[PDB]
A paper describes a structure:
Altogether CD38 appears to be a key player in the biosynthesis of calcium messengers which are involved in a wide range of cellular functions. Thus, the catalytic transformation of NAD+ involves the formation, via a ribooxocarbenium ion-like transition state, of a unique reaction intermediate that partitions between several competing pathways such as an irreversible hydrolytic process leading to ADP-ribose and a reversible minor pathway that governs the formation of cADPR. α-Helices are found mainly in the N-terminal and membrane-proximal domain of this transmembrane protein, whereas β-sheets are preponderant in the distal C-terminal domain.
In agreement with observations on hCD38, incubation of crystals of wt bCD38 with rFNAD and aFNAD resulted in stable covalent intermediates whose structures could be resolved at high resolution. In both complexes, residue Glu218 was found covalently linked to the anomeric carbon C1′ of the fluorinated-ribose ring in an axial (α-anomeric) configuration. As in the Michaelis complex, the 2′-fluorine atom of rFNAD interacts with a conserved structural water molecule that is hydrogen bonded by the carbonyl and amide nitrogen backbone groups from residues Val116 and Leu137 respectively. Thus, although both copies of the enzyme contains a covalent adduct formed by reaction between the carboxylate of Glu218 and the C1′ of the N-ribose of rFNAD, the conformation of the covalently bound intermediates are quite different. In one copy of the enzyme (chain B), we were able to model the complete ADP-2′-deoxy-2′-fluororibosyl moiety in a folded conformation with the adenine ring stacked at full occupancy against Trp181. In the second copy of the enzyme (chain A), we were only able to model the 2′-deoxy-2′-fluororibose-diphosphate moiety of the covalently bound adduct. In contrast to the more extended conformation observed in the Michaelis complex with rFNAD where the adenine ring stacked against Trp168 (see above), through rotations around its C4′–C5′ and C5′–O5′ bonds the adenosine moiety has flipped over and the adenine ring is now stacked against residue Trp181, a position close to that previously occupied by the nicotinamide ring in the active site in the non-covalent Michaelis complex.
Numbering used by the authors: 41 to 277
The structure:
């Protein structure tokens, strides 16, 4: 029925198993959380509904069970730097969205339902461009991203791509949802990191980063920007 790839096979089992692994072996001691209840809430958010009428409100109950809150001074944002940013966060024992409970559950997966049915659509799912932006996969990442940004505290870091013409993309989730909802008075450190021995194409003094700085000034968030670093110099530091 849709243009996008279908749901991850065995979605329900994958998320519950990821939840067990996360809560018991990845970030334990926190107060306890029921993984069966989390799985049930996640399914209830989208199953049997119109797959192109997802709203942020559909996810309030799921997120309340496990908000994407990272301890102060440990939070990492990224944009166009997925691989690098996660390497960095892993090495420094920091957390990206994909390191929160719900982000860990959902990372890399696909899901959508079908009206009337209680089952996943494993055959096809709304593509964001061809079908609808208001789909359950896209909306999940948006609302999770917003709460993650709102809960950030003290010093936060962002890894950006110094090999693009514009390291800051105002239409990205980081630019649209995260930066504009950053808790006021936190401090943000940006790292603009470039490839290989390929000379950077954007810097902290470029137009796009000046736009980011304007947003942060508006949030009363202090900004420090470092650039002209290759992947190795950034990670080795």
């Amino acid at each position: 029925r849709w243009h996008g790839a279908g749901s991850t096979a065995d979605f329900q089992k994958i998320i519950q198993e990821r939840c067990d692994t996360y809560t018991q072996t990845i970030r334990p001691g926190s107060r306890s959380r029921n993984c069966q209840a989390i799985r049930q809430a996640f399914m209830s958010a989208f199953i049997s509904k119109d797959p192109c009428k997802a709203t942020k409100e559909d996810y309030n109950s799921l997120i309340n069970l496990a908000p994407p809150t990272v301890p102060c001074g440990q939070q990492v944002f990224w944009s166009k730097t997925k691989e690098l940013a996660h390497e960095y966060a892993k090495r420094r024992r920091l957390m990206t969205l994909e390191d929160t409970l719900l982000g860990y559950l959902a990372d890399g997966l696909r899901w959508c339902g079908e009206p009337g049915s209680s089952d996943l659509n494993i055959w096809s799912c709304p593509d964001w461009r061809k079908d609808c932006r208001t789909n359950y996969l896209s909306v999940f990442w948006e609302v999770l991203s917003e709460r993650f940004a709102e809960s950030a505290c003290n010093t936060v870091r962002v890894v950006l791509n110094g090999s693009l013409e514009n390291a800051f993309d105002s239409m990205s989730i980081f630019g649209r949802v995260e930066a504009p909802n950053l808790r006021p008075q936190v401090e943000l450190e940006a790292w603009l990191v470039h490839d290989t021995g390929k000379p950077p194409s954007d810097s902290c003094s470029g137009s796009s980063i000046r736009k980011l700085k304007s947003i942060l000034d508006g949030r009363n968030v202090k900004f420090r920007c470092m650039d002209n670093l290759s992947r190795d110099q950034f990670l080795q530091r």
